[PDB]
Write an enzyme that holds these catalytic residues in place. Structure first.
Site, short mmCIF file in Angstrom:
data_model
loop_
_atom_site.label_atom_id
_atom_site.label_comp_id
_atom_site.label_asym_id
_atom_site.label_seq_id
_atom_site.Cartn_x
_atom_site.Cartn_y
_atom_site.Cartn_z
N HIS A 71 0.79 -1.23 0.00
CA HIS A 71 0.00 0.00 0.00
C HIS A 71 0.82 1.28 0.00
CE1 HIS A 71 -0.31 -0.12 4.57
NE2 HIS A 71 -0.05 1.17 4.37
N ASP A 95 -0.20 -7.78 1.55
CA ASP A 95 0.18 -6.34 1.53
C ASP A 95 1.69 -6.20 1.80
OD1 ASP A 95 -0.20 -3.50 1.38
OD2 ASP A 95 -0.87 -3.35 3.50
N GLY A 151 2.07 6.36 9.01
CA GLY A 151 3.47 6.35 8.60
C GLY A 151 4.31 5.29 9.30
N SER A 153 3.38 1.83 9.14
CA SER A 153 3.20 0.56 8.44
C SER A 153 4.57 0.13 7.91
CB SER A 153 2.24 0.73 7.28
OG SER A 153 2.77 1.65 6.34
C1 LIG Z 1 -3.13 4.11 10.88
C2 LIG Z 1 -1.95 3.65 10.48
C3 LIG Z 1 -1.85 2.37 9.77
C4 LIG Z 1 -0.57 1.63 9.52
C5 LIG Z 1 -1.22 2.40 8.37
N1 LIG Z 1 -1.88 1.51 7.51
C6 LIG Z 1 -2.97 1.88 6.86
O1 LIG Z 1 -3.43 2.98 6.96
C7 LIG Z 1 -3.66 0.85 6.04
C8 LIG Z 1 -3.71 1.33 4.61
C9 LIG Z 1 -5.01 0.73 4.12
O2 LIG Z 1 -4.88 -0.65 4.06
C10 LIG Z 1 -4.63 -1.21 2.92
O3 LIG Z 1 -4.44 -0.63 1.88
N2 LIG Z 1 -4.55 -2.52 3.09
C11 LIG Z 1 -4.31 -3.37 1.94
C12 LIG Z 1 -4.32 -4.72 2.61
C13 LIG Z 1 -4.13 -5.94 1.98
C14 LIG Z 1 -4.09 -7.05 2.78
C15 LIG Z 1 -4.26 -6.94 4.15
C16 LIG Z 1 -4.44 -5.70 4.79
F1 LIG Z 1 -4.63 -5.61 6.10
C17 LIG Z 1 -4.46 -4.59 3.97
C18 LIG Z 1 -4.69 -3.16 4.38
C19 LIG Z 1 -5.97 1.04 5.25
N3 LIG Z 1 -5.07 0.89 6.35
C20 LIG Z 1 -5.55 0.78 7.60
O4 LIG Z 1 -4.82 0.67 8.52
C21 LIG Z 1 -6.98 0.95 7.95
N4 LIG Z 1 -7.57 -0.10 8.68
C22 LIG Z 1 -7.75 -1.32 8.19
O5 LIG Z 1 -7.46 -1.65 7.08
C23 LIG Z 1 -8.43 -2.28 9.11
C24 LIG Z 1 -7.49 -3.36 9.67
C25 LIG Z 1 -8.27 -4.58 10.16
C26 LIG Z 1 -9.18 -5.08 9.03
N5 LIG Z 1 -10.07 -4.07 8.52
C27 LIG Z 1 -11.34 -4.41 7.99
C28 LIG Z 1 -9.74 -2.77 8.56
O6 LIG Z 1 -10.48 -1.90 8.17
C29 LIG Z 1 -7.14 2.21 8.80
C30 LIG Z 1 -6.88 3.43 7.90
C31 LIG Z 1 -6.26 4.72 8.49
C32 LIG Z 1 -6.33 5.92 7.50
C33 LIG Z 1 -4.97 6.26 6.83
C34 LIG Z 1 -4.71 5.64 5.44
C35 LIG Z 1 -3.38 6.15 4.88
N6 LIG Z 1 -2.39 5.11 4.81
C36 LIG Z 1 -1.40 5.08 3.91
C37 LIG Z 1 -1.76 5.14 2.59
C38 LIG Z 1 -0.79 5.12 1.61
C39 LIG Z 1 0.53 4.97 1.93
F2 LIG Z 1 1.38 4.92 0.96
C40 LIG Z 1 0.93 4.84 3.24
C41 LIG Z 1 -0.04 4.85 4.24
S1 LIG Z 1 0.63 4.68 5.82
O7 LIG Z 1 0.44 5.85 6.55
O8 LIG Z 1 1.93 4.22 5.72
N7 LIG Z 1 -0.30 3.63 6.53
C42 LIG Z 1 -0.21 3.32 7.82
O9 LIG Z 1 0.61 3.77 8.55
#
Ligand SMILES: C=C[C@@H]1C[C@@]12NC(=O)[C@@H]1C[C@@H](OC(=O)N3Cc4cccc(F)c4C3)CN1C(=O)[C@@H](NC(=O)[C@@H]1CCCN(C)C1=O)CCCCCCCNc1ccc(F)cc1S(=O)(=O)NC2=O
Ligand SMILES: C=C[C@@H]1C[C@@]12NC(=O)[C@@H]1C[C@@H](OC(=O)N3Cc4cccc(F)c4C3)CN1C(=O)[C@@H](NC(=O)[C@@H]1CCCN(C)C1=O)CCCCCCCNc1ccc(F)cc1S(=O)(=O)NC2=O
Ligand SMILES: [Zn+2]
Ligand SMILES: [Zn+2]
EC number: 3.4.22.-
Lengths: 639, 639
Positions: A71, A95, A151, A153
């Protein structure tokens, strides 16, 4: 552009688990390094602070592979000493992506103790205690707001001994408060590192005896929709071939009659033909309309363009995956030219020329020279109907035979023979099959995103985004078809393919209700089959949430539903449902935009605040958050 | 960094007003140009697409000056042919900034027709019709969402003849929908073109016959708080000297006794001394506690550190500006070293050294060498209490004599003599008098921002931001006072000074209620006097909104109010009032964080959802948006 190491998180090797950040690069060095792919800087530590131009996150070195999240990184290369390092592993389902660590660099090793007391390392260099609750889950001892973990992940989940338990992937959150963490387990990376790097899906699978789901990753020019079904049929088999486009469906039937001498069964809403042949060409919509799979009808079902993230394709493929084994099918073939994690590669027949400011036609901050389009058949991609109108008008003023094409327009607008400049949106690829001398791409598209905003419920916003590898391929694919073609672009920057928004799931429950006489529980069953199938585009599992929402949207006004459905806009069930509560309250819609036309006639009799259920665009009226449906939808969020 | 021209909006010179965008730089060229300040590129057109690293907006050429918004550009230089062009004009009150246009810049000319049919040019090169309603206001014919107009500030408002009416400054919006535009009138620009190049106020004003408000812009240590009052007192006038700090206020009584031979009256909450002298030193808080101005008490009131955006200073200065003429004062002196729009200049006895990664002590991604702080008296600025604790503990482990200091700690923690490393937040600035051998600055601060989030009402969030020219100056200013100092920093980047958030106004109404027995209407009167006074920090006029909010917060629980006031945290009135609503509805608080400590004696009785009035932090409990106070606050947002 490459992923760039911009800093590192340094972990203590003795005593308690502590960490500190060390920046190694600023924005300038980061941008230069991204362009070149050359990073001569010495890589140190196990946790890296990585960056793209748009995003920053973490990467962890475990067993000599530098791992991050798909992602964040997509299929991007990592800037290294000798230049760009290509991903060794790309697992969209987990992911997880991985590059070979620049030799010498320190790695974490997998945990052996089997401890449940875990420690999450953040981009802030904070060590957050986590209690392991499952294979890929752990609960935060003290809840943190979501923004605190952004940030982080790709960061590690450590055991008390400082070994790797997993890589932080997603936050388990309710109403913007993170209460648990979802992680990729280290044993999954250990499986990946033990298995074959390359897999073969370029040739169609042989028909097995037991039911099986196969992948077919072959170019558009392999005849996944023509040669492949013909081949299977020649082998004496009953084949169903599904596609998102009516034009594609009819055209492949027209090709099979003229070319392979077989008159196939055609199933579209526009035209249905029943010959009793062993091959049937249907759209996903018609298949869903028909009720999906009927017993002993087909042996092989080919799901063409299975990379398509439209709600019909998702619901169609999901239906196939849930029903096929039962209805006596022996093989399901998920076919695509662009599988998730695809990287656009050069095409031998297509010359790619970056658009510059040298030109007489303004186009997305760049320019189109009049010579590139004067005479010949050309296709220009615009992100919106507005842009199409403006560009086709500007070109018509310059004496160029220009035509705009988008949703709600007839395909007769496109001349099938003369000099022409077709100015179109992505609506073209499902409406028309023709090919062109050159393609001019704006490199942007329009997407819908769901925001769990709590004002009072959720918001479905339309946004302009950079195109992904799939978009670039389908668009460029309009030229260089068995002859030489030219492709001109505004930018080469593509976004990661194979991922879709939760609003797409919301559209599936919407379609299920509006068009397919499917209860939310029936839809969940079908989408579950799609989600649990590997190798397909991925999405957040919001199945139970959306099911619960729609389950409560009872007693919609049939007349509003009929109107929204005919108008052809996104969300006919949610729009008609909001109108239903408005009309019943003698209350005005959230605004007087075209979205709410089904209420125009009631305008003199509508007064007061709007009983707002959710936000589908701009709300210009006063709102009331007291309606029982709003309270119901709010209760669905707080689960 | 300099402001960089990255593109241009090209306007039609004939017929209807049409526009098109043309990009001239990419992110790389933009970043390089920002660093160097050298832009050799030709400047075609009247409307420019300008960019900083963090922001993009527009600039318009009017009568040879390239104009933009202060909020966009701050006091930043513009990248030019010969290098950085310094601003010729900086008017924070009008939000207007102007640089001398380079060669090639075709300038628009002011409108003479006096037409009310206007056309707003956006960064998307769209020409939006506007109906002029006032001097600086115009209504949009069709409401557009706020996000559509972001990045268009500094863009022109044209008449039908294509002349300049004004520059786009702010959007008049309700619940995220823009219905009107606020613009700087073109005539107000020629008023700026008149304004002096020096504007001398380095010397104190002579006492006038009639009441007057004067500005005093002189360096720190120049005796604005000592020589100036003593000089006025010697002439036979009664002088009141106001400061944000108790430590400074007390300090001034010792220096004035020994040096100027005057034993002054001291007024602080901690200590009050009444000698009957013609000079009084008081904090703004004590002055507010005392009831403000009493008749015929003072001739001159000096408002020292008038650049301070704390709620007490704003409310204190506002009180002075509303009451002074009436109470018989003849002169109000707004004194400061850093007026709005200030640019940090080198200090002659301060050596400035950027931190590197060479060091044994991690500090904000950079490092501190142990030799720079081992022995001597040093002050390290951290953005938070958390970071202070960690740094002071790391240093104590290395045998350094380290001490953390922040809000809620006694100043006795700082040794007044002895080798020491003081690790502090901006709380030091008002608690501690002293000077250090060196200052190490993290270059970041914590600010509170109001978000009109509609979930259900508003949110007051704490955010980390880059420091402004005032912050950099106050912090650096803790070394080099009468002895050679050293200043070490993480980054040179500084944001624009002289602007504050609407949440600061919310804190004024809060303090008025909690501490000053001030009704919302009394507070509004006082803040209006501050707002309507030029040369002071600027803010959005939200007085009527906040007044209306607080006016509805009736019958607070006195015991909760006492408790929140005693804990010393940010919004004692809003916290106590939410608790009052919880206790009365017999519902638990939004969370069990320290913020809600007052409701602990009721933890077993309170159950169910929270009647949420507004968001002050994380909400972990279920919410109800049905409470009449929530509906009242929601109705306040509508205008
Ligand atoms: C809060 C911090 C979290 C660690 C973090 N991760 C995320 O956001 C992830 C991104 C998005 O998830 C995905 O794209 N995936 C794809 C995918 C494929 C397989 C298994 C997975 F769990 C996932 C999750 C939603 N996320 C999530 O965590 C979301 N939650 C879920 O997916 C949950 C987990 C449990 C299962 N279900 C159903 C969910 O809804 C919460 C979203 C928070 C809003 C912020 C989104 C911005 N993220 C972002 C986007 C682009 C980038 F290049 C880098 C980033 S980041 O900034 O680097 N991301 C992160 O740091
Ligand atoms: C949305 C389009 C609008 C034109 C726009 N302008 C704004 O945002 C301004 C910024 C801020 O205003 C100011 O800072 N000032 C400083 C100042 C000083 C004296 C007189 C003034 F009118 C102002 C206005 C709030 N704004 C506003 O317009 C706000 N509204 C008001 O101030 C209104 C106007 C009428 C009176 N009252 C009470 C208001 O509240 C709407 C809030 C929108 C959210 C913030 C958007 C991001 N702003 C932003 C921040 C930093 C940048 F470098 C560049 C930008 S931008 O992207 O370049 N901004 C813009 O393009
Ligand atoms: Zn272990
Ligand atoms: Zn005119």
């Amino acid at each position: 552009g490459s992923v760039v190491i911009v800093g590192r998180i340094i972990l203590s090797g003795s005593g308690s688990i502590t960490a500190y950040s060390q920046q190694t690069r600023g924005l300038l060095g980061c941008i230069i390094t991204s362009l070149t792919g050359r990073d001569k800087n010495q890589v140190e530590g196990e946790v890296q602070v990585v960056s793209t131009a748009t995003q920053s996150f973490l990467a962890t070195c475990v067993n000599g592979v530098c791992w991050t999240v798909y992602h964040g990184a997509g299929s991007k290369t990592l800037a290294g000493p000798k230049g760009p390092i290509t991903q060794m592993y790309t697992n969209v389902d987990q992911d997880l992506v991985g590059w070979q660590a620049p030799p010498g660099a320190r790695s974490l090793t997998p945990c052996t103790c089997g401890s449940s007391d875990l420690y999450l390392v953040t981009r802030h260099a904070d060590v957050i205690p986590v209690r392991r609750r499952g294979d890929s889950r752990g609960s935060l001892l003290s809840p943190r707001p979501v923004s605190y973990l952004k940030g982080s992940s790709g960061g590690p989940l450590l055991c008390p001994s400082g070994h790797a338990v997993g890589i932080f992937r997603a936050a388990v959150c309710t109403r913007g408060v993170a209460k648990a963490v979802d992680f990729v387990p280290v044993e999954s990376m250990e499986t990946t590192m033990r298995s074959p790097v390359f897999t073969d899906n370029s040739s169609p699978p042989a028909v097995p005896q037991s039911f099986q789901v196969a992948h077919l990753h072959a170019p558009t020019g392999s005849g996944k929709s023509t040669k492949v079904p013909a081949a299977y049929a020649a082998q004496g088999y009953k084949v169903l071939v599904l596609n998102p486009s009516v034009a594609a469906t009819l055209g492949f039937g027209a090709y099979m009659s003229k070319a392979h001498g077989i008159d196939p069964n055609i199933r579209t809403g526009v035209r249905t033909i029943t010959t009793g042949a062993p091959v049937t060409y249907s759209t996903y919509g018609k298949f869903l309309a028909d009720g999906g799979c009927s017993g002993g009808a087909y042996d092989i079902i080919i799901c063409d363009e299975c990379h398509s993230t439209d709600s019909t394709t998702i619901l169609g493929i999901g239906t196939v995956l849930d029903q096929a084994e039962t209805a006596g099918a022996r093989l399901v073939v998920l076919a695509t030219a662009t599988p998730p994690g695809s990287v656009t590669v050069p095409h031998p027949n297509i010359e790619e020329v970056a658009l510059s400011n040298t030109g007489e036609i303004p186009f997305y901050g760049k320019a189109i020279p009049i010579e590139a389009i004067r005479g010949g058949r050309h296709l220009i991609f615009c992100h919106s109907k507005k842009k199409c109108d403006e560009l086709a008008a500007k070109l018509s003023g310059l004496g160029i035979n220009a035509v705009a094409y988008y949703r709600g327009l007839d395909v007769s607008v496109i001349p099938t023979i003369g000099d022409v400049v077709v100015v179109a949106t992505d609506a073209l690829m499902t409406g028309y099959t023709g090919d062109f001398d050159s393609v001019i791409d704006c490199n942007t598209c329009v997407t819908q995103t769901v925001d769990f905003s709590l004002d009072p419920t959720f918001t479905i916003e339309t946004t302009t985004v950079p195109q992904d590898a799939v978009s670039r391929s389908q668009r460029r694919g309009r030229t260089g078809r068995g002859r030489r073609g030219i492709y001109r672009f505004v930018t080469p920057g593509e976004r990661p393919s194979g991922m879709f928004d939760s609003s797409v799931l919301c559209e599936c429950y919407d379609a299920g209700c509006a068009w397919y006489e499917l209860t939310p529980a029936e839809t969940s069953v079908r989408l579950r089959a799609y989600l649990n199938t590997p190798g397909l585009p991925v999405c957040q599992d919001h199945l139970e949430f959306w099911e619960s929402v729609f389950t409560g949207l009872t007693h919609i006004d049939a007349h509003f539903l009929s109107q929204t459905k005919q108008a052809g806009d996104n969300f006919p069930y949610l729009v008609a449902y909001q109108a239903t509560v408005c009309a019943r309250a003698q209350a005005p819609p959230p605004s007087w935009d075209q979205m709410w036309k089904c209420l125009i006639r009631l305008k003199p009799t509508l007064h007061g605040p709007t009983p707002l259920l959710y936000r589908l665009g701009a709300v210009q009226n006063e709102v009331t958050l007291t309606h029982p449906i709003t309270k119901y939808i709010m209760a669905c969020m707080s689960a």
